[PDB]
Amino acid sequence: IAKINLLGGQAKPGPALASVGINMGEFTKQFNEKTKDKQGEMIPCVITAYNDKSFDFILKTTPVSILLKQAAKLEKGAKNAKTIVGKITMAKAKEIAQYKLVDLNANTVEAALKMVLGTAKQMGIEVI
């Protein structure tokens, strides 16, 4: 089996939801129930490779590099790291890392800040 990445909310048909070992009626109802208000964002999800697809449903935090407009105060210009239009503050970065801390595989705050900054470095933006 392969990874899944589906929109948060109602999705009766999926890329593979009829031959993975689960019922779509028994899946999409709870998928939408868990993400009823969280609709309209490309949310990362994970499907288990286990043979019975036991109920261990998990969700991740909203992706970085699409929300960098709030954190670094820019309008998504050239993607190179040699051109820049703005600077990232400390308060926005701390808030976004605090929100994304549940996505990490470790319980540490400054590490979360550095991870989010390094991911945002795709734009070439660094803390001033």
Partner 1 sequence: AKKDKAQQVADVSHLLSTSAGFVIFDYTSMSAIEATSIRKKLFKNGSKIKVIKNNILRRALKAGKFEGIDETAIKGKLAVAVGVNEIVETLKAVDGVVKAKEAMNFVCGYFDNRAFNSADLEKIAK
Partner RNA sequence: UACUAAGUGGAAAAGGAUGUGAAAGUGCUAAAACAGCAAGGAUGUUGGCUUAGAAGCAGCCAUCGUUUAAAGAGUGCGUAA
Partner RNA sequence: ACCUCGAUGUCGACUCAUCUCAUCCUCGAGCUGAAGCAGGUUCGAAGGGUUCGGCUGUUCGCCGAUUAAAGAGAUACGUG
Instruction: Work out whether 15 is an interface residue with RNA (CB under 7 A).
Output: yes
Instruction: Work out whether 10 is an interface residue with RNA (CB under 7 A).
Output: no
Distance, in Å, from the CA atom of 85 to the CA atom of 95, rounded to the nearest integer, reads 21
Residue 119: C-alpha distances to residues 17, 99, 123 (Å): 32, 15, 9
Q: Which of 40, 105, 110, 128 binds partner 1 (CB under 8 A)?
A: 105
Q: Which of residues 106-125 bind partner 1 (CB under 8 A)?
A: 106-108
Partner that binds at residue 107, options RNA, partner 1, none, CB closer than 5 to 8 Å by kind? partner 1
Q: Which of 1, 58, 66, 109 binds RNA (CB under 7 A)?
A: 66
Q: Are 126 and 90 in contact (CB under 8 A)?
A: no
Q: Strands (DSSP E) along the chain, which ranges? A: none
Distance, in Å, from the CA atom of 52 to the CA atom of 30, rounded to the nearest integer, reads 17
Binding residues for RNA, rule: CB under 7 A, are 2-5, 15, 42, 44, 60-61, 63-66, 79-81, 100, 103-106, 108, 111, 114-119, 121-122, 124
